[PDB]
Design a protein around this ligand. Structure first.
Ligand code: CZT
Ligand code: CZT
Ligand code: MG
Ligand code: MG
Ligand code: MG
Ligand code: MG
Ligand code: MG
Ligand code: ZN
Ligand code: ZN
Lengths: 324, 328
């Protein structure tokens, strides 16, 4: 019906994911993953029973929190679909193995599962059980990985059951490497290294990137999923506005818990003294544009339309801020 | 004192400041409470209860609970090993080249890290835990699986009734100590040894000393690097001890290794290097251990604190020759 038609846009930047969420009965992660697995022939390639895939996807989606405004199944579905588009970028054609593709997409799907709606720093500062378990280091990201993998153990949920032992081991390593790179405390180091990779990049005659060891390959996959994670401001304004609403709602909820606890309220988490437009322009200027302009460099000119949208949205958000 | 255990014992504890304290004797004389007894002694000696306002009964309660979470049926990675690493770190901290270098909080961190650094060790390796798809390796994504766990347990036990030995630290002190203890225990992961050593060599190359040969450390990076390597050295100090101690440590690690190999053999897995009781060369393996891991590390530490560690290095070399001479 009016879902198969929306899902026709699954290979396009700017898919109406919120509409897909509504139409699927709040199952955007399940429907979008299913669609992409079929589109990429992943069920056949890895002999994944279709009922197993769906069973896993639904239990995974169940473990995203409905009451968390941003870090929920819609965000997961969005990052999955964005990674799916980025994987098909011409500069990367025939570069990645089917296993590497599967790993990037699986990592995207689980990368925020069971997110509590508060930051690593909040969890550390409040002496949470999660921070105790993970010694204050990539607390959330370690946890997302543990839960994501743990769910494969549920009845008829092992989608990787027919991979070889070697394939499963390689897949597990890549997925861990990828989800740990979504920790924002690693952003500047990832970016610094990505800039250096761009500086020294190698391309075939056909113009596709040459990545001849695991380090270079996983580095590209890490940054790709990181870009997808940080892709909201590169989307059409109607979508970007919705993501901004959600992250500010989530932030203000954390800020309210901090205020109640007598804690200093984290930057951008105070509903009373916040500035959304200023916050987004700063987010684009200091994080999202520096990353995406580097990705654009890597795959030039594949990402120029995405960069254009980002730059237009920045100019849009800054337009109502008085300036000299 | 610290444990209502028999007699004394006090004569043995007179060696708490010396390399080659007889920790096994201490374990026996204390009713298998060497970690509690030795930690209590060191905290009193260094006046740490007064400095950090640690109630003595809180200290003893925590130490007993901590000690209870080292497995009695694990041959090597048990409470005696923890006590040994604690006591060895305590000796290393007092080396002349480090006089007045570390704050009392840094000293507390090193000693506390040493005490918890293998707690709840199951007697099998990280690689075994990964290969067998253990819940622990799933929890920690195959990375420093044991060492992350040791830290989690060591800190969690502070929350048991009357166990918070850090209750009278300031918020900042608690935060700093927590970071240092994590940095130190994660550095005991043997997978980090080569990198750790490489960086230690770099530090020795650019080492700054006063005229009395005392190290000049400039910042947290310097201080934590020395503490990480210090506790790593303590962890790898068995072959540098009086031979009778070393011989018992060797017997114990081989027993633990063989038990892991038995588990591997039973599950049809490739038996890990040095874990096959049916095909072992214990003496040869000790010489290889010294040549490729322990001597390169301790020679570098010896350089850092020259000449403070000369005797320790000499003993290492003598002990290498013992195992050499006993290869069949
Ligand atoms: C649409 O906009 C966004 C979309 C995603 C995100 C992604 N956020 O992931 C962050 C983690 O939860 C942790 N941070 C939370 C914060 C309270 O403290 C920081 C130390 C860490 C942010 C967006 O805009 C935001 C940041 C800039 C203005 C609002
Ligand atoms: C007295 O000798 C020793 C004293 C301590 C130790 C400390 N070991 O900690 C290691 C961890 O449990 C994990 N390893 C287990 C092993 C089966 O596989 C490795 C990949 C990692 C070792 C000693 O001897 C060694 C080398 C020669 C005989 C064993
Ligand atoms: Mg995340
Ligand atoms: Mg004597
Ligand atoms: Mg020992
Ligand atoms: Mg250990
Ligand atoms: Mg210095
Ligand atoms: Zn995310
Ligand atoms: Zn140890």
């Amino acid at each position: 019906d009016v879902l198969a038609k929306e899902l026709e846009d699954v290979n396009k930047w700017g898919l109406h994911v919120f509409r897909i969420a509504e139409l699927s009965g709040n199952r955007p992660l399940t429907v979008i993953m299913h669609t992409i697995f079929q589109e990429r022939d992943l069920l056949k390639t890895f002999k994944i029973p279709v009922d197993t895939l769906i069973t896993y996807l639904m239990t995974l989606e169940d473990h995203y929190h409905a009451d968390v405004a941003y870090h929920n199944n819609i965000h997961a579905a969005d990052v999955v679909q964005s990674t799916h588009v980025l994987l098909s970028t011409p500069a990367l054609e025939a570069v990645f193995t089917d296993l590497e593709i599967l790993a990037a997409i699986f990592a995207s799907a689980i990368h925020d599962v069971d997110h509590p709606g508060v930051s690593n720093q909040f969890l550390i500062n409040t002496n949470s059980e999660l921070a105790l378990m993970y010694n204050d280091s990539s607390v959330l990201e370690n946890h997302h990985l543990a839960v994501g993998f743990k769910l494969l153990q549920e009845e008829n949920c092992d989608i990787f059951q027919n991979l070889t032992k070697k394939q499963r081991q390689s897949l597990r390593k890549m997925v861990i490497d990828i989800v740990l790179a979504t920790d924002m405390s690693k952003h500047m180091n990832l970016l610094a290294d990505l800039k250096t990779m761009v500086e020294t990049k190698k391309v075939t005659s056909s113009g596709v990137l040459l990545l001849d060891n695991y380090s270079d390959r996983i580095q590209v996959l890490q940054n790709m999923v990181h870009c997808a994670d940080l892709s909201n401001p590169t989307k059409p304004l109607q979508l970007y506005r919705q993501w901004t609403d959600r992250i500010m709602e989530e932030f203000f909820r954390q800020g309210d818990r901090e205020r109640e606890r007598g804690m200093e309220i984290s930057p951008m988490c105070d509903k009373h003294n916040a500035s959304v437009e200023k916050s987004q322009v700063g987010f684009i200027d200091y994080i999202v544009h520096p990353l995406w302009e580097t990705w654009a460099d890597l795959v030039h000119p594949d990402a120029q339309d995405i960069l254009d949208t980002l730059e237009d949205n920045r100019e849009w958000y800054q337009s109502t801020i008085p300036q000299a």
